[PDB]
Amino acid sequence: TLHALLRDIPAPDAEAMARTQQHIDGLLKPPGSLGRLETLAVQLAGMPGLNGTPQVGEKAVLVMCADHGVWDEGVAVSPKIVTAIQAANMTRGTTGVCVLAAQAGAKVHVIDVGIDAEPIPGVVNMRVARGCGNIAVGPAMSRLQAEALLLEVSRYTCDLAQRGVTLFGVGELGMANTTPAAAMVSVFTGSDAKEVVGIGANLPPSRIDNKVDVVRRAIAINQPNPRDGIDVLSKVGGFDLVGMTGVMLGAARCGLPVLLDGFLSYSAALAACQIAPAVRPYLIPSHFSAEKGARIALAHLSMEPYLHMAMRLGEGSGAALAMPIVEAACAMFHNMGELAASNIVLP
Amino acid sequence: TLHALLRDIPAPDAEAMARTQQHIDGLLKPPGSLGRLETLAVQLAGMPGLNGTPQVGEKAVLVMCADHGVWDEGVAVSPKIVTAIQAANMTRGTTGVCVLAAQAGAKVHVIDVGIDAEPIPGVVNMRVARGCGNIAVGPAMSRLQAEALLLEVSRYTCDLAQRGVTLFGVGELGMANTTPAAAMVSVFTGSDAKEVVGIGANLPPSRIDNKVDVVRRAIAINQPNPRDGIDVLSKVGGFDLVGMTGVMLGAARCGLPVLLDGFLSYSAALAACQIAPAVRPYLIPSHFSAEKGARIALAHLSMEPYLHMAMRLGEGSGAALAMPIVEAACAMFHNMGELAASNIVLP
Ligand SMILES: O=C(O)c1ccc[n+]([C@@H]2O[C@H](COP(=O)([O-])O)[C@@H](O)[C@H]2O)c1
Ligand SMILES: O=C(O)c1ccc[n+]([C@@H]2O[C@H](COP(=O)([O-])O)[C@@H](O)[C@H]2O)c1
Ligand SMILES: Cc1ccc(C)c(N)c1
Ligand SMILES: Cc1ccc(C)c(N)c1
């Protein structure tokens, strides 16, 4: 089933991309003058789910919520209940992503993949358990739990495509999740924990040493295999991270674009690309996270964010903020006039 | 008159900014987690024309169009008539800024401050002459012509404020204008011409040496005084550059925000800040121009753009692209919920 999923991810349509480039070169402007906006429009044109042209229909931001057992290691200053409280606030439209998604005309889907609290009405229920295992002393979950969630979220994502959604944004919510995210980044990039462990949600500079030690213990004890993205996710990841990876696999299978968010999303994208390299062409960066390990993670994904906002909230807020940029590349493509029509000739 | 203008530019309102910061710190998120979006909202709150709160009413992009005599020195590959043709296309909504402004819900004002062609219907007429003087052999214009245009554009800009406009964007259109822009940057920053001369609108790499020589000749022959922003503008600038500087002085006098665009706008902002330092707090960067001298210009304005799009079209296209970011900071401020209301307490 998951093998079928991964097997059926479409390659980009080179024919549509060639037609796109030619059309862009003929627009009313010096060739290549709109830089990354042009490359973005061509990238979009190659995505099968977009019907050979850069376009944006409905937009959705999927927010994966879960708690982590590693919170008990004192790696986070936010009360663990904030996960459940914020998840509820998501249904009320008062959070950061809700406000930014509203601005971009996108709908937010709040998905509970493992919150340690009673079920929250209004939230999509896909909970694996009440929080994942404490990665400092063992695995976050079993391989089967990771594979099942990947499959479940993948299907949900591509099912939305059937309802008009053509652009996705990924996000998360889970106290302490920058710890497993750092563990995954260290494992995938081969970087020492000290280089990728950040302050997360305002962790005091005096408590960073403990966080670094926790990440190292998690790796030593679990011995995750860097060449097996699912092994890494299940051992030192979390339900929320798995869920984000699932959105990326689902959209790619659907041949549609996915906007990344911040540091947590970069770790999930590293896992997704390890599991299936064919997912890469569907990923679009949004902003450059203020988290310490962002530069290393982005270098390994070979991505250069469009927005430098020093943001570090998460929730998919950066993804929503970049949606207007994607629509701008589409507007450029479809609405600009052409050089030939104005009798303009440039060498 | 111009002395009155410069004298009456308001200082930022520290009281409104303090109230803004306190409100932002209390929003439903870890303090400072939205980074530059928070600093932007506070900056806006201090602008008197915004009534003590970050808000955006109507938006306008002012595009200054003019031709340059230095075009005859072979520093540009685009036919000189493109200025007049593109200015006309601006009235038809087919250009890059028109499409991006439409996306942001902004109106484009096309202003002819010196196009070397017959008047174009639909374009605001403020032409000083049919193109400015060739800066390679003398001044672009007289000091009085520069001062008069500054005053004229300044008044037009603040007059729009009376019609609901609260956010401005500046742009230009003029073949060969990256040459005087480079001259101004060299003069204001004390950088050698070779470090700030770029390829402009696809100038062949083999013709760059000539462009560098032209910039040096312009400076040697005119001897512009770096401490007199108006002296520099009139000697080695152009009508379009003067006009952009005028929008910045007008909006600041009006106590309203102005979004910069690319390299041409950075040179105009250096002039404006030299003429009146009080203008600085009203300037908002948009993107990081692909032009070679952008890094140096931005360092001297002490600005860090939000968008890295490798754009180099001009027209105010980058300014329009960043307008959604300004509205996002306002939406964050007014629409997010508060920590206290959810009983959340963070150290
Ligand atoms: O998206 C980022 O780059 C990001 C960077 C730092 C912190 N966060 C958010 O803060 C939480 C993780 O921080 P922490 O200290 O509990 O590990 C989680 O709920 C994220 O939404 C998010
Ligand atoms: O805005 C920029 O950063 C920008 C950078 C390079 C070129 N341009 C545009 O191209 C023109 C100047 O290029 P050039 O080669 O004629 O000096 C002018 O009409 C600008 O709108 C604009
Ligand atoms: C077509 C065309 C050519 C050159 C420039 C600078 C613009 N703005 C447009
Ligand atoms: C309030 C609050 C606290 C911590 C985080 C990570 C979010 N998203 C929100």
Side-chain angles (χ1 to χ4, degrees), chain A residues 27-31 33 339 342 344 346, chain B residues 78-79 82-83 85-86 89-90 95-96 172-178 200-201 264 312-315:
Chain A
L27 303 173
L28 217 39
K29 57 176 178 60
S33 60
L339 292 164
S342 291
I344 299 176
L346 304 172
Chain B
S78 302
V82 167
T83 302
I85 293 176
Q86 267 300 78
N89 287 333
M90 293 271 168
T95 71
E172 44 53 63
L173 176 63
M175 304 306 106
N177 69 5
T178 61
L264 295 320
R312 54 182 172 75
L313 169 66
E315 309 187 1

Side-chain angles (χ1 to χ4, degrees), chain A residues 78 82 86 90 172-175 201 313-315, chain B residues 27-30 339 344 346:
Chain A
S78 302
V82 167
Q86 267 300 78
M90 293 271 168
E172 44 53 63
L173 176 63
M175 304 306 106
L313 169 66
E315 309 187 1
Chain B
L27 303 173
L28 217 39
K29 57 176 178 60
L339 292 164
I344 299 176
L346 304 172

